[PDB]
Design a protein around this ligand. Sequence first.
Ligand code: K
Ligand code: K
Lengths: 220, 211
Amino acid sequence: QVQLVESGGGVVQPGRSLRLSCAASGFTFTSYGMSWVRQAPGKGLEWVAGISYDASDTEYADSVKGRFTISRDNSKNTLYLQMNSLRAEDTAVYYCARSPDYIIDYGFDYWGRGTLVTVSSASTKGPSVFPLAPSSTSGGTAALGCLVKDYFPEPVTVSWNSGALTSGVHTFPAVLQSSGLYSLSSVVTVPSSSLGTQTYICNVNHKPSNTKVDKRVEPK
Amino acid sequence: AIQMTQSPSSLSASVGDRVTITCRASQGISSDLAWYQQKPGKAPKLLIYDASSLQSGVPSRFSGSGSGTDFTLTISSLQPEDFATYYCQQYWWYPFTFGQGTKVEIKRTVAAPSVFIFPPSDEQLKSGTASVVCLLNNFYPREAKVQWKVDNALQSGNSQESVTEQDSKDSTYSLSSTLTLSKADYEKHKVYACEVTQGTTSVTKSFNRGE
Ligand SMILES: [K+]
Ligand SMILES: [K+]
C-alpha cells in the first residue's frame, strides 16, 4: 500500500522560509527517486525539484534554483523541501511524487494528497457571510445564496441546511481580490412556493481561522 | 528549458467518441514523454510512459504514440469517467516540464441561462462596500457576455467573474458576476442592471435601489 503524505503547508509571508515533509510507506523508499510537483490555483502542473534514490543527485526548476533545497532521510523514509525566500508566485498546492526508477525518469507513478502553501502578507481572517436574498420574481423557481467575502487563506467549505440541501447547489471557486483576501458565492435554486415555510441556512466553515458561520437567508 | 504545448486547450466530446489530444515539444525528446489524467481536487494519475507504454491499471482504450517532437494521446471510446484534464510531461532533460493541459468536457445541447440579480445586503452596506451579484444559472456552452450598467453607465474594471465546473446532473455551467462598489458610490445611483448576452438572446435583470 504505497502512501505519500505531505505536511507543513500553510501561510508564509514573502521572504520567509517554509519546510515541507513527505512521509512515505508501502515500498522500498531507498530504491526510488522522489520529486516535488506544485500546482498554482487554477493553473497547470510544474515540476519543482527531484532527488535520486541515494540522495547523490538533485535537480531543480529554473524559478526555484538557489531558493529551494530538496533532500531525503532514507532512515526515516521522509522527503523534504526547504523553501527559502518565498514569493507570491510560489503559492500552490505542493505534491510529493515517486518515479518508477532510481532517478526521476519515466514519469511520476505515485502522488501524495498535496499540501497548500500560501505566500502573502495578508493575515488569517474568517469570512463575512452576507445573504443573497430572494424576492417571487422568477416564477416557480427562486434563487438565493450566501456571499462569502474577505477571508484568508483558502479554503472554505459551504453546505446548505447542514448538508440536507444538496440539489441545485452551486458553490463558485474563490477569486483573489485586490485587498489580498478571497471571496466567493454559494447559490441554490429552490421552489418559490417553499420560501414562506422552509428555512435556508448556509454553513460556512473556515478551518484556517477555526471559524464556522451559519447564515439564515430570508426573503426580503 | 523544453516547452511542451498541448492542443486544444479544451474540447467537448460524447461518451463513445474517439478523442485525440496532441502534445508537442520545442526540442527532440525521443520517447521520454508521460501522460497524466487529473480530476478536480485530486492528484494526477500516470497514464502512459515512454510515449506509448501503458501504465498498470490504465484501461486499454488509452494509447499513446509519437516520437521526437510530435506526440498524441488517444482515447478510442470515451467513457464517463474519462472527462478530466490531461497533461503531457517530458523527462528528456532537466528541468522537467509539463504541457498546459487539455480539458475534456461533456458535449450537450445549448442551454440558456436563468439570470438572477442580488442587491447588496443592508448588513454589508454598514461595512462601507457594496457587492452586487449577478447569477447565470445552468447554461451551455461556457461562453457568455455579462455587462453591468449603473444608471445606463457601462461599468468596467469593478467586476469579477467566476465559473463552476460542469454540473453532475445536466452538464451545464453556472457563472457569477460580482460588481464591487463603495457604499458612497452605491447610494449615489438608482438603477443597477446586469445584461447577459448568449447567441441571439440578451437578457437584462435589474433592480432599483430602494424597492
Ligand atoms: K518495492
Ligand atoms: K545536479
